[PDB]
Amino acid sequence: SQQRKVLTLEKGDNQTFGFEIQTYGLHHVEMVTFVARVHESSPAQLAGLTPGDTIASVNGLNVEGIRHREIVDIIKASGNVLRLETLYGT
Amino acid sequence: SQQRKVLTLEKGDNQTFGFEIQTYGLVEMVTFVARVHESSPAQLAGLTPGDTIASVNGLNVEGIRHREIVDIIKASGNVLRLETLYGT
Numbered sequence: 001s002q003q004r005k006v007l008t009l010e011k012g013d014n015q016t017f018g019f020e021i022q023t024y025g026l027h028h029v030e031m032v033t034f035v036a037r038v039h040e041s042s043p044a045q046l047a048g049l050t051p052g053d054t055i056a057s058v059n060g061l062n063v064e065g066i067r068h069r070e071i072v073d074i075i076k077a078s079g080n081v082l083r084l085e086t087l088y089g090t
Numbered sequence: 091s092q093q094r095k096v097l098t099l100e101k102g103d104n105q106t107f108g109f110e111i112q113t114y115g116l117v118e119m120v121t122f123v124a125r126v127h128e129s130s131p132a133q134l135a136g137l138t139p140g141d142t143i144a145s146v147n148g149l150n151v152e153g154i155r156h157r158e159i160v161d162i163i164k165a166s167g168n169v170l171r172l173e174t175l176y177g178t
Contacts, residue, residue, distance in 0.1 A: 024140035024177035026120050027093070036125075036139075052112060052124065089114065 003088035004056065011043040011080050018042020019049055023068035033063055033071060034089060052089035059083050094144065099135040099170040107163070107170060108132040111143060113156040121151055121159055122177060140177030147171050 009017045018039035025031050033055040038044045055063055058074050060083065075082060099107050108130020113121045121143045126132045143151055146162050148171065163170060 022140055024122060026114065026116065026122055026177060027142040027144075027175045028117050028120070030116055032114070054114075089112065 005048075005053070005086050005088075007047045007049060007084045007086065009043045009047040009049065009082040009084065013080065015043070017044050017075070017082060019044035021055060021068070021071065023071070031065075033068065035086065047084075049084070049086070050089070053086040054089050055084060056087050057085040093175045095136070095141075095174050095176070097135045097137060097172045097174065099131045099137065099172065101131040101168050103168065105131075109137055111156065111159060113159075117152075119153065119155060121154070121156070123174065137172065137174070138178070141174040142177055143172060144175055145173040 011017055019035055019042065020037040021033050022036040023031055023033040035044075035049055035051050035053050035055065038049050038051050055071065057063060058071060059078055061074065063071055101107055108127040109123055109132035110125040111121050112124035113119050123132075123137055123139050123141050123143060126137050126139050143159070145151060146159060147166055149162065151159055
């Protein structure tokens with residue numbers, strides 16, 4: 001059983017990838033970043049990004065002990081191609 | 091520092107509370123508020139996405155999965171009592 005998925009999102013210059021993430025401190029506290037929304041017809045949806053799944057890594061960077069802002073910053077710095085690793089949330 | 095909040099949601103007969111839950115495996119399975127709709131009973135009650143649900147109508151939900159919790163919520167009728175922990 002493999003709950004780890006690797007995806008590639010591609011977009012145009014003045015376009016966004018079409019997804020929202022939220023980092024929550026879940027009480028056993030564990031910080032977990034979730035895909036909160038994926039827009040219909042978006043690059044994220046086309047890449048197969050699923051709402052509810054958790055972000056494991058962004059462009060090769062394990063998001064383990066890093067701030068939610070770091071993740072957003074990394075995504076914005078990624079340009080038109082974004083590499084993500086997710087884990088089954090649902 | 092009190093991470094625990096107690097809430098009371100109230101709705102009408104032919105409607106829902108306006109929120110979705112998600113059971114996530116970390117102890118073990120934990121359930122949190124996945125989504126809260128705009129203008130909903132849940133939003134009005136202060137339910138906030140990302141908060142861990144500790145109990146429902148006085149029942150500790152620790153070792154319980156998604157469907158059983160939803161069943162409890164459905165059986166609750168128009169009033170629902172929840173205890174949640176800060177996720178943000």
